[model samples]
Target: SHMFSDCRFGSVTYRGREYRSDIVVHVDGSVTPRRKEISRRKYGTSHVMAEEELEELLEEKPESIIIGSGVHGALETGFRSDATVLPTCEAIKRYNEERSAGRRVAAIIHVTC
Candidate 1:
């Protein structure tokens, strides 16, 4: 689906629009810019996806969670045992395919390294 397309070093194309910042594609189909500053504040770096940040996203209790771990695969997915962690480009494909299959999926994508 066009909801997710190509991703680059610093941006993700979704629904024909480009999101230049990290983003959360919620199960309900809403898109929001990720509040990575909280992770940066707590962990002293945004490279770690903190539990607090993940908590907010998991409120919807998606059946599957996909994380696009930045272009260079530099982001840490903490302790999410149920998450499929991958580089941005590959993560986008997994996300789209699952979504098309009608899975209740959620995705967190990091655009930059």
Candidate 2:
């Protein structure tokens, strides 16, 4: 998987009772070597725990996954670690890698900021 382009906001979701955030969409394609490289670089492992969890809940592997990064909600912020920003990118990157590896996973990341 390769980053075809930069990330962009697509929309926003606000649930009065519990949630709110900005929606961001990213697109990418799949290829084995690229996926392996990304997985090693970002996760330091070829396996995505979130993806595994989703597969377990859905009872099947999804074609892709969308990760929502908490914004004005509750998230830690610090140098080299900004939950609102980092998680979204990480999630998308992981999804792309898995998708490229033929794991049938892709991702759309939503960041609430």
User: Which candidate wins on lDDT?
Assistant: 1
Top-TM-score structure, candidate number:
1
Tens-digit per-residue lDDT, 1-113, candidate 1: 53687788998888888899899999988898898888999889988888777676689989999899989998886665788999998899899999989998888899987
TM-score of decoy 2:
0.33
What TM-score against the true fold does each predicted structure earn? 0.92, 0.33
State the displacement of the C-alpha of residue 40, model 2, in Å, after optimal TM-score superposition. 36
What lDDT tens digits, residue by residue, belong to model 2 across residues 81-101? 112234554555555555557
Residue 31 C-alpha lDDT in model 1? 93
Which regions of candidate 2 deviate over 4 angstroms? 1-4, 8-60, 63-66, 70-86, 106-108
- Name the weakest run of 10 consecutive residues (lDDT summed) in model 1: 74-83
Reference-based lDDT, each prediction? 0.86, 0.36
Least accurate 10 contiguous residues by lDDT in model 2: 11-20
lDDT of 2: 0.36
